[PDB]
Amino acid sequence: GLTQPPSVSVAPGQTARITCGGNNIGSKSVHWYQQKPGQAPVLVVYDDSDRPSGIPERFSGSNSGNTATLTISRVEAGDEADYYCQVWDSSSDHYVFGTGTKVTVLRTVAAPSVFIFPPSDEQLKSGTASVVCLLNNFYPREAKVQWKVDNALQSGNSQESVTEQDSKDSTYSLSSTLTLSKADYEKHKVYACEVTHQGLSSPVTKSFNR
Amino acid sequence: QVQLVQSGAEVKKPGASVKVSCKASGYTFTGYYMHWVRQAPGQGLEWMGWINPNSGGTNYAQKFQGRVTMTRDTSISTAYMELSRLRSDDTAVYYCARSPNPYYYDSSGYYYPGAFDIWGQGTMVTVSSASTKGPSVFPLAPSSKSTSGGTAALGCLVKDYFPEPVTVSWNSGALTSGVHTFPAVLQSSGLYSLSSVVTVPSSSLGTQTYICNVNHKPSNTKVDKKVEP
Ligand code: NA
């Protein structure tokens, strides 16, 4: 119910500023929560500007008019998280959370290490074939993974998932799974994933000839 | 110190109900309000309501009134949240979180709007008509196609299970560094699939054994799979 920018990007050492928009929000107490991937939210700032014990002085807050602001000075990789502002609304007796802001920490571009895995014989025996393409520790997030079977582009038969920014080196990893029936898998010989990324001077292909 | 520990993951059919517990330890249970906040996968935080553990009084968010019930057991310092008539969009992680009540309890008719300074680990609740299913675990064998400059990649494919979550460890927890366990994706079959990978030195691929340990509690499925080159 409170307005936050979906994303804020900042280089290490720079200052990140996350805004929390709400009509006359300055007349309310604003609290801020940090939620790292896969973890519970952690209180970082309460009552506009007060900090719980254990939270670094790099975190500061302000609130006036129609904008509250969480300021993170000297941003580092450990600051990668979603940040939620919060307010108690006396007029409605509800706690209201902001829509959340993901802080991404910039770093130097890093090309993915590409690996490829054929399906196991045990899975093959069950009548399906899954082949996996792994892109390890790359930056930035934007990457293109194309499956090729006997040089032919595949569509609709693959899914991928990407990890959030690593808390130490600010990189991502990606896993793409190509799935066919064992019958369709046996019709063809060459299985390849072709990855495109900023850290790659040109696209790179990993393959196996079955 | 001070922590909030919630119960394990739950699977329910639509129309059914679910009850999550939240055990408090390290402080005076009746001293702090206990809130419930949920979060749908990839979405924001949504406040459900609070209970005053001392009086038992409650305040439910409008969206859940007539559907949610918050209770407590002071003797074991545990708070409870029950959501009835579940629908698929109730699928979320459910957190408990405390807020200070300096007026505990020489006052009434007044709520102190404190911050949520301590949160539980969260409880995943899936609401679906689909059947609970244990995963098949297949090895992701290391090879020359998975080596780079002295390091090799291997892993496990945890396929066709329902519902979330599964836990994956390596060598019974001994191996932790260089592990990437990816977010599960929902397949067109309605079943989840996930991969866990580990980057290890290639020189050890002959002299070291790697086993992934998969535990899918909702189906009581425990699988150990040896990953061989
Ligand atoms: Na539970």
Residue numbers in the entry:
A (entry chain D): 3 to 212
B (entry chain A): 1 to 229
Copy out sentences from the published article reporting this entry, exactly as the authors wrote them.
A generic approach to assemble two different heavy and two different light chains into a bivalent, bispecific IgG antibody (“CrossMab”) without artificial linkers was recently reported. To reveal potential structural effects of the crossover procedure on the resulting bispecific antibodies, we report the crystal structure of a human Angiopoietin 2 (hAng2) binding “CrossFab”, i.e. a Fab derivative in which the VL domain is fused to the CH1 domain, while the VH domain is fused to the CL domain (“CH1-CL crossover” in). For comparison, we also determined the crystal structure of the corresponding “uncrossed” Fab.
The original, uncrossed Ang2-binding Fab was obtained by phage display of a scFv library and belonged to the IgG1λ subgroup. The CH1 and CL domains can be superimposed with an rmsd of the Cα atoms of 0.40 Å, demonstrating the high structural similarity between the Fab and the CrossFab. A striking difference of the Fab and CrossFab structures lies in the elbow angle, i.e. the angle between VHVL and CH1CL domains. The two molecules in the asymmetric unit of the Fab structure exhibit elbow angles of 138 and 145 degrees, respectively, whereas the CrossFab molecules in the asymmetric unit show 163 and 167 degrees, respectively. In essence, there are three pairs of residues forming hydrogen bonds between the VL and CL domains in the Fab but none such interactions were found in the CrossFab. The measured affinities were 35.5±0.09 nM and 37.0±2.6 nM, respectively. Melting temperatures of 71°C and 66 °C were measured for the Fab and the CrossFab, respectively.
